[PDB]
Design a protein around this nucleic acid. Structure first.
Ligand SMILES: [Mg+2]
Ligand SMILES: [Mg+2]
Ligand SMILES: [Mg+2]
Ligand SMILES: [Mg+2]
Ligand SMILES: [Mg+2]
Ligand SMILES: [Mg+2]
Ligand SMILES: [Mg+2]
Ligand SMILES: [Mg+2]
Ligand SMILES: [Mg+2]
Ligand SMILES: [Mg+2]
Ligand SMILES: [Mg+2]
Ligand SMILES: [Mg+2]
Ligand SMILES: [Mg+2]
Ligand SMILES: [Mg+2]
Ligand SMILES: [Mg+2]
Ligand SMILES: [Mg+2]
Ligand SMILES: [Mg+2]
Ligand SMILES: [Mg+2]
Ligand SMILES: [Mg+2]
Ligand SMILES: [Mg+2]
Ligand SMILES: [Mg+2]
Ligand SMILES: [Mg+2]
Ligand SMILES: [Mg+2]
Ligand SMILES: [Mg+2]
Ligand SMILES: [Mg+2]
Ligand SMILES: [Mg+2]
Ligand SMILES: [Mg+2]
Ligand SMILES: [Mg+2]
Ligand SMILES: [Mg+2]
Ligand SMILES: [Mg+2]
Ligand SMILES: [Mg+2]
Ligand SMILES: [Mg+2]
Ligand SMILES: [Mg+2]
Ligand SMILES: [Mg+2]
Ligand SMILES: [Mg+2]
Ligand SMILES: [Zn+2]
Lengths: 80, 177, 136, 116, 52, 66
RNA sequence: GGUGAGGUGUCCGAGUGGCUGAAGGAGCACGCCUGGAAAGUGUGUAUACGGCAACGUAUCGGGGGUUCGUAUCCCCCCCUCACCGCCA
RNA sequence: GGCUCU
RNA sequence: UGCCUGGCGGCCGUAGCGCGGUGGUCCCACCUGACCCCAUGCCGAACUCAGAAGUGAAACGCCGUAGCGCCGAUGGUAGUGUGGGGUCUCCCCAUGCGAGAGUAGGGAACUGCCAGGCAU
RNA sequence: CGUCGUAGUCCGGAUUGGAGUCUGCAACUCGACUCCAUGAAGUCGGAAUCGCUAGUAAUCGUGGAUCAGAAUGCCACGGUG
RNA sequence: UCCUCCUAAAGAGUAACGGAGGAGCACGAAGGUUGGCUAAUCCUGGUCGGACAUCAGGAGGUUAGUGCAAUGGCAUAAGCCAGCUUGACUGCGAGCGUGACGGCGCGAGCAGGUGCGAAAGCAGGUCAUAGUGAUCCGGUGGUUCUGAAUGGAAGGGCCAUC
RNA sequence: CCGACUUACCAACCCGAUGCAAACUGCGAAUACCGGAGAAUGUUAUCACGGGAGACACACGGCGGGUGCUAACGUCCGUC
């Protein structure tokens, strides 16, 4: 008999990711992306939350797009 | 601006000749003079720093900017933010008037003056020298002080090379050697 | 015995050894010992085959070793139940795919390199072959 | 250098008005002249424009790069904007200080009828 | 947990209070902030008092 | 420049032993009497004299005659 | 096998991040008394350093490390001290 | 007061 | 309509670097001065103001240039969904998808709105 | 009589550089002295320890022997006391 | 118990006495806003000054920084200076996310009143993700809501809070 | 003190070539998943509410893996 360990810990899964995909009609206030950083960025009719959460300010379809000189990823809401 | 007039009338014609510049804007010119006093011993007391800035304010009629540590080192017993030195930037007429009082008064008041070095031009025309003792300036009273400070002078000019600044200072009769 | 000086981590997963190799052609030297089989070698097997070809060439020529054992291998001790943490790092291996050039050699004739690499392959668990520098 | 730091100094408010959808007044300042232009919310085309480089404005002036020229420019661009029916804009200082010729321009445009 | 807790009493005569924390070692001077008082519907100076 | 923080910077006269009268702006206030100026400094004659190696053979031949 | 504590100049002994290259003491060297010694009494004291030898290198068990910085903090190696190594 | 050996 | 320049964009390296060359009527830039607006934890350096003597030196713009950066096929290879098989730590067959890297090669951006200048 | 006026000083004179004199065949190792400059330590000395009872101690100069030259040593002499 | 990465099989989620690290706070400014700024390291020269303080130029281009672990972000800076300040507001909240549930989270916008800014606007704590404990019982302030014949009161309720 | 040289004795940076990575990524699939449109098929196979449960000891096999010795009719996950 003998031994021990030191690597037993881990945290809970925060359920991040993309909640609504492209071409997918949403309501105002609908969470599109939950994320840690700004892996994506807020485009037209899309707000950025306190935790870099991307929510829809209006109603319509989700548009993923890459803009800017740095090729950053923007999310926009088309009208509907 | 006496030397500024002497530059504009005789030095520019001199250097345009001795370098064969196409344009007159291609000529060197002096831009600023920086007067540092690194006081690493003021962590003992502020008054050593506080009185050295008072001495350097008499030399150049500006209030000096008291500098601090960029980072923390333990070999010098300093933390990032301690006031550790003082600087003065001199431009314009006060630059020229200090450079006049320098090469006319203070350099002869150097103990055992025998010339400067022409190997102090930092590869890109900008000249830097260091004096051992502030009493060579007549601004400082000999009786009023107790402690021999020291400072260093850094002449930042627009000369690209090292020789264009060497000819520029030689045009100002700068005592190299 | 070859071994990494520093490591970012002390232990590693067992992984797999599937796929083809990349170090196929004789890059540096003239003759090569190419692995045909699949498996994992060790620092002992590498250093023993290096000694066997250094002695077989009488320090004539130049010998490259293309592989390096960087994977730590754990074992649990005797009379230890299967739980209670991962075992201790015991030795170091290099994963070998088919096609990997293991050793290279020049400055010697071909027949001497053949008998040297044969004495080396007799120290290796995997099946090898002899290759030469191909133009293109 | 100075041009680039001016652009960095301006490129936050330009993107902010870009997402606000704001019809935007762009000021540009030189030592000799001062420029103004009203830009559509797409940011790719203009509506009205005024400057001290125009003859109709410069011939009425002493120096093109003083405060009186800047007020004459903000007056001309405001009277042209209200002529074209553009009334509410948002002022882009374009990386300059809201001071001096820029402030005198915006005070002229406020006085002439624009709303910012 | 050296950062103790206090309350910010309205100076408008009402007993309304905000609750908050402070480091009493490093900030010995009293905290005074101008906060909204929902009873009077005005911004009123609140002052530090004891949490009791 | 700022208004109050700087010391007084006033034009005074500095005269020298060679009679080099020079008016400079300074923080001294009163007039200045010098000892050596750049005009009268022995940089152009004295520093030429001040090497003074001297000969060992010349001292030897100087001290006597054969 | 595992647990807990720990490794300091000749020795003992302080010291658990900021003159602690280290107290203090004993010891060692020098001196002084003694006919000589001891015991005394006073005075000093780590190791390689070299720039001229001023003061940085270094070393708290060895190796690694981080914090601006470690004798103290942490990590591996060991070495040693106390406990457990039971039931069948 | 106490103070060893040679 | 042509040329040049400035401003605001689109696009985000085939668009960037480098190297050489080139521009001053206008524009721009540097530049002159600062009692003033305003400013410097000192400094008219910057910011700002009042200006226009000078210069295109720098910067910027333009032209050229394959030292790079970048882009980049075709074919093959790796992988893999399903079904099947073997000598089953790993592979193969039918079928479908099909990279990355590399090669040939491309390549010294294109374009919109407004204003001004010189020509027409 | 004047001077310094409590300081490492107009104290102290070491050390060192340069220029010299003399003795002596000959002053490098290895002499004494002079001149100019240089201006250390040292601000009355731990434990411990020495001498001295009157012209004594203390202090001040002088001479001689030895010796070409070469003493702060030695042996003598007087002064103040 | 909680956080971060891998394992985790390119949506989410996913276990082991699997591999590695952290948390049980801090801040009345280290928050808000307005204005401005842009590193690390190295090279050369330079009084004391030295490997290493401070100063000037150049290379470099974020290899730095983020109050703390890691990951993801960060130049429009979320990083760094200064001015003014208290939005570290109260009542609400369309609509979604996430959990068996208790619960947790994001949130434009509305009403009042406020701060900065010329203004557009921004602000309902901090770059985000750890910094925590249900109910009961009891305490404190406020509030006529209730008040065992009635008027009060005790006590209770509601709000805030320990 | 200055160094004299030479000797390569090692070697930084940089350059070229070559490998390796679950906690590396200037690239990047197949599948899977989410959403939309459209046929054919399927005894609504879907969702909501309500009545009643049982069950929460799984096993092997294929594939992708952790651990173990790519040992176990071993163990722990995903999927069938
Ligand atoms: Mg028993
Ligand atoms: Mg005995
Ligand atoms: Mg006896
Ligand atoms: Mg200017
Ligand atoms: Mg040019
Ligand atoms: Mg292909
Ligand atoms: Mg490809
Ligand atoms: Mg190109
Ligand atoms: Mg080009
Ligand atoms: Mg006298
Ligand atoms: Mg003397
Ligand atoms: Mg002394
Ligand atoms: Mg004394
Ligand atoms: Mg004699
Ligand atoms: Mg006598
Ligand atoms: Mg996943
Ligand atoms: Mg998956
Ligand atoms: Mg912060
Ligand atoms: Mg800002
Ligand atoms: Mg340096
Ligand atoms: Mg944070
Ligand atoms: Mg209970
Ligand atoms: Mg009642
Ligand atoms: Mg009652
Ligand atoms: Mg991977
Ligand atoms: Mg049912
Ligand atoms: Mg159960
Ligand atoms: Mg179960
Ligand atoms: Mg199961
Ligand atoms: Mg399996
Ligand atoms: Mg098994
Ligand atoms: Mg099983
Ligand atoms: Mg298994
Ligand atoms: Mg199970
Ligand atoms: Mg299975
Ligand atoms: Zn003179």
């Amino acid at each position: 008999a003998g031994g021990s360990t030191r690597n037993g810990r881990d945290s809970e899964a925060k359920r991040l990711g993309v909640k609504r995909f492209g071409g997918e009609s949403v309501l105002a206030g609908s969470i599109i992306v939950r994320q840690r950083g700004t892996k994506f960025h807020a485009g037209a009719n899309v707000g950025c939350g306190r935790d870099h959460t991307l929510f829809a300010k209006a109603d319509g379809k989700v548009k993923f797009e890459v803009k800017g000189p740095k090729n950053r990823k923007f999310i926009s809401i088309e009208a509907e | 601006a006496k030397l500024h007039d002497y530059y504009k009338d005789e030095v520019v014609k001199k250097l345009m000749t001795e370098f064969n510049y196409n344009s007159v804007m291609q000529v060197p010119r002096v831009e600023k003079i920086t007067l540092n006093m690194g006081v690493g011993e003021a962590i003992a007391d502020k008054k050593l720093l506080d009185n050295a800035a008072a001495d350097l304010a008499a030399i150049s009629g500006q209030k000096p900017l008291i500098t601090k540590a960029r980072k923390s080192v333990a070999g010098f017993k300093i933390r990032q933010g301690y006031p550790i030195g003082c600087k003065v930037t001199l431009r314009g007429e006060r630059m020229w008037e200090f450079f006049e009082r320098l090469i006319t008064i203070a350099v002869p008041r150097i103990r055992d003056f025998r010339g400067l070095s022409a190997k102090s031009f930092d590869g890109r025309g900008n000249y830097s020298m260091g004096v051992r003792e502030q009493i060579i300036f007549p601004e400082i009273d000999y009786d009023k002080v107790d402690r021999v400070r020291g400072l260093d002078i850094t002449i930042t000019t627009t000369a690209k090379s090292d020789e264009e600044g060497r000819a520029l200072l030689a045009a100002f009769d700068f005592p190299f050697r | 015995m070859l071994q990494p000086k520093r490591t970012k981590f002390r232990k590693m997963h067992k992984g797999r050894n599937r796929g083809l190799a990349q170090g196929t052609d004789v890059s540096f030297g003239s003759f090569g010992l190419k692995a045909v089989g699949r498996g994992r070698l060790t620092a002992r097997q590498i250093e023993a085959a290096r000694r066997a070809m250094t002695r077989a060439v009488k320090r004539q020529g130049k010998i490259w070793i293309r592989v390096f054992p960087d994977k730590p291998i754990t074992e649990k001790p005797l009379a230890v139940r299967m739980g209670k943490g991962k075992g201790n790092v015991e030795y170091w291996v290099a994963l070998i795919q088919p096609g990997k050039v293991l050793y290279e050699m020049d400055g010697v004739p071909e027949e001497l390199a053949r008998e040297a690499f044969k004495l080396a392959a007799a120290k290796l668990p995997i099946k090898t072959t002899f290759v030469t520098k191909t133009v293109m | 250098d100075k041009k680039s730091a001016r652009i960095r100094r301006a490129t936050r408010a330009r993107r902010k008005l870009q997402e606000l959808g704001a019809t935007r007044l762009v000021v540009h300042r030189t030592p000799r002249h001062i420029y103004a232009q009203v830009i559509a919310p797409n940011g790719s085309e203009v509506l009205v424009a005024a400057s001290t480089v125009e003859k109709a404005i410069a011939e009425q002036l002493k120096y093109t790069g003083n405060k009186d020229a800047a007020a004459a420019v903000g007056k001309a661009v405001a009277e042209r904007a209200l002529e074209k029916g553009i009334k509410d804009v948002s002022f882009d200082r374009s990386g300059f200080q809201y001071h001096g010729r820029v402030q005198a321009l915006a005070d002229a445009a406020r006085e002439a009828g624009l709303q910012f | 947990g050296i950062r103790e807790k206090i309350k910010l009493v309205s100076s408008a005569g009402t007993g309304h209070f905000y609750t908050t924390t402070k480091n009493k070692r490093t900030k010995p001077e009293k905290l005074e902030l101008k906060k909204f008082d929902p009873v009077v519907r005005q911004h009123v100076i609140y002052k530090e008092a004891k949490i009791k | 420049m700022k208004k109050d923080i700087h010391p007084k910077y006033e034009e005074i006269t500095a005269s020298c032993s060679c009679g080099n009268v020079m008016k400079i702006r300074s923080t001294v206030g009163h007039d200045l009497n010098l000892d050596v100026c750049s005009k009268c400094h022995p940089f152009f004659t004295g520093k030429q004299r001040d090497v003074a190696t001297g000969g060992r053979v010349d001292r030897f031949n100087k001290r006597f005659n054969i």
